[model samples]
Target: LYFQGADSCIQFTRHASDVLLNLNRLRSRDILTDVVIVVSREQFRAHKTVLMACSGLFYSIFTDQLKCNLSVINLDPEINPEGFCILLDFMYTSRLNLREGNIMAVMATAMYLQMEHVVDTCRKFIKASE
Candidate 1:
């Protein structure tokens, strides 16, 4: 239910009508760059972060954001920093490019982010992998 925040889903649906909306900021040209770019928009409906991360899968994120500053609730079981980064990337972008061996990282990130859907998805994925 944590994933039911309705942020990403609403942004995509409304993008066509709301030209000036946050989602429009992510133009087609940006998706082609395939690198981490500054996405300072703090709004949730903003799809730029997600779309770019979607197209630019498997790239290392280079940023100075202190994880401690994010203030995301730390669940009982914490995810590794790399896994959390990967899940955040997926939340912004729809692609699930994580490999089988890295499912542990994905689980850790999902749990840390409190994204129920992603955590459940990773659980099923890992179970299937077995």
Candidate 2:
């Protein structure tokens, strides 16, 4: 297709939206997870591919530094499991609701995990709330 008009534009539909929805559904159902993340002595199930797709940090840890272990990812000690749940849920749904107390932990975890959108969203939410 050749477009010579200045007003010409590419159009895309929400067809791709189903992909995330399905992934989220599968996650919520705890199906087909290959990796387990450990935080606050709790286990958070996840997929390496899906997580690597969302964060380069996870990719590096899974593939390079941590040697792609499918057993467990012991998260940073300071990160609360409940707060980390927000980040994991966001990875699935691409939607995060930042509450007052949890916002800081979520923002820090997002920044460490190289999730720019999450960090920006939390920052914006804080600004708007203020």
What local distance difference test score does each model get?
A: 0.46, 0.81
Output the lDDT of residue 32, model 2. 91
* Model 1 lDDT per residue over 89-112, tens place: 454445566787788877665554
Clashing pairs in 1: 50-92, 79-108
Model 2 agreement with the true structure over 10-100: per-residue lDDT tens digits: 5344435667889888877888988888887888888888899988788888788546855677888888776789888877776786789
Q: Which stretches of candidate 1 lie over 4 Å from their true place?
A: 1-79
Clashes in predicted model 1: 2
Best by lDDT: 2
Lowest lDDT 10-mer window, candidate 1? 55-64
Superposed by TM-score, candidate 1 places the C-alpha of residue 76 at a distance from the truth, in angstroms, of: 10
